[PDB]
Amino acid sequence: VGVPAALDMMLTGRSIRADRAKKMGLVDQLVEPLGPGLKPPEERTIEYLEEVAITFAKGLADKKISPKREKLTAYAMTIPFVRQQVYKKVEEKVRKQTKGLYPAPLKIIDVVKTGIEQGSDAGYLCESQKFGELVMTKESKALMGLYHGQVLCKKNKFGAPQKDVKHLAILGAGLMGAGIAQVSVD
Amino acid sequence: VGVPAALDMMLTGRSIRADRAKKMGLVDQLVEPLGPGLKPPEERTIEYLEEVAITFAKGLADKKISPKREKLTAYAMTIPFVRQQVYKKVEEKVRKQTKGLYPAPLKIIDVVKTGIEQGSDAGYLCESQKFGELVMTKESKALMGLYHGQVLCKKNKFGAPQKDVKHLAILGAGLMGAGIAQVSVD
Secondary structure, three states: OOHHHHHHHHOOOOOOOOOHHHHHOOOOOOOOOOOOOOOOOOHHHHHHHHHHHHHHHHHHHOOOOOOOOOOHHHHOOOOOOOOHHHHHHHHHHHHHHOOOOOOOOHHHHHHHHHHOOOOOOHHHHOOHHHHHHHHOOOOOOOHHHHHHHHHHOOOOOOOOOOOOOOOOOOOOOOOOHHHHHHHOOO | OOHHHHHHHHOOOOOOOOOHHHHHOOOOOOOOOOOOOOOOOOHHHHHHHHHHHHHHHHHHHOOOOOOOOOOHHHHOOOOOOOOHHHHHHHHHHHHHHOOOOOOOOHHHHHHHHHHOOOOOOHHHHOOHHHHHHHHOOOOOOOHHHHHHHHHHOOOOOOOOOOOOOOOOOOOOOOOOHHHHHHHOOO
16 A cells, blocks of 8 residues: 555554545445345344355356555655655654653554665564563553553443433533533434 | 766766866866976976965865856755656667666666665765775676786787888778878877
């Protein structure tokens, strides 16, 4: 997909829905799900993709369709000299967004800094000397426990819900009331 | 001076007078010779440059003048990707001008092919593995004898010239007569 295209993807952390992934170019074909079926209305949609896959699949064996395919096409061959003048702009970007005391994310930049212009297949062993470093460090060692608690408190944790709510009553407008209405309405 | 600027110089063989060397940029300052002197009219011109040199020279020690300085400036930083797309154009240029059975001149191209993009100071020993090759070969071994004869027959070789000519008489116009007049007149 490209250095500048996914460089604001793989370390921004944030996910993308399937709609922009066509215009991005990771996945190419889309198929919308189904409603009612002879089987319950979601089990067919997981069994619908098998046949769209098999009707793509025989075409791949005898090559009726090709796995080939306007801003990235401007970039697509053009980096002989602007090399430092992109990841330097990113080098100070990561320390203007956050501060410099995250030793995590710049340590994936050195991958894509060395993956370009050097041995690509030889580049698949640099991160072997890197993944063991920044996992066995004091930056994100407790970050796994943060994630365990993150998933651990998105749980009901009190028995079973009895007599669920459907209406609310927010006594007082202002900044909290209209505020919590802004999230509790959709 | 540049790859495309002198690339049509160092293997075209041909010399340049001092007038175009300023616009080229090898030599920077010019000085025209002199006529009559208190000493004979050419010995002063070789003794004139000593003082123009010494009046440049004291300025170089205390830096009043600098050794710094529009088609080459377009090139001057711009070769990240057009690399093959210049010496390939030259690669078939040398075999369209001559034919391919000169193993001499392409063996200075590989110098300037490897001098760019690789170790420059390390590049000063490649031609040590090259100059010994194309001098000790059967291409130009007799070319030195051709040059000995070239200088050897630009000589009077018959005593001293007695009663030199000043007039000519060309009996018959056409292609030789007007032809040899074209060279014997200037």
